[PDB]
């Protein structure tokens, strides 16, 4: 009974951690990609516009 009781808790606690951390992946990847794309957008907003105005 003690072995089974320990095994039940261990099995309950083993699996859910990776699935819960996968909830991180979507939001963290969205934030990182959106901010990198915002960096690219900031780089590109000046590149064409300043050249056009400098002409």
């Amino acid at each position: 009974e003690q072995l089974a009781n320990a095994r039940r808790d261990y099995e309950a606690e083993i699996a859910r951690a990776r699935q819960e951390a996968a909830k991180i992946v979507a939001q963290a990847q969205e934030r990182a990609k959106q901010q990198e794309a915002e960096i690219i957008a900031q780089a590109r907003r000046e590149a064409e516009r300043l050249k056009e105005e400098a002409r």
């Binding site: 000046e46 590149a47 516009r49 300043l50 050249k51 400098a54 002409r55």
Partner: protein, 50 residues
């Protein structure tokens, strides 16, 4: 910074063109004014130098 550099790049060609055009116009002023000031009177300087 890179956009400033790119604008200077176009300005660099424009600046070189402006300098060359100004100097060439100054030369052509001598070329145009040469006929009125004297077409073949430049031999005097060469005789003294040579």
């Amino acid at each position: 910074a890179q956009a400033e550099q790119e604008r200077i790049r176009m300005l660099s060609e424009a600046k070189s063109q402006i300098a060359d055009l100004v100097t060439l116009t100054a030369s052509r002023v001598l070329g145009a004014e040469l006929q009125a000031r004297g077409h073949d009177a430049l031999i005097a300087e060469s005789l003294a130098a040579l």
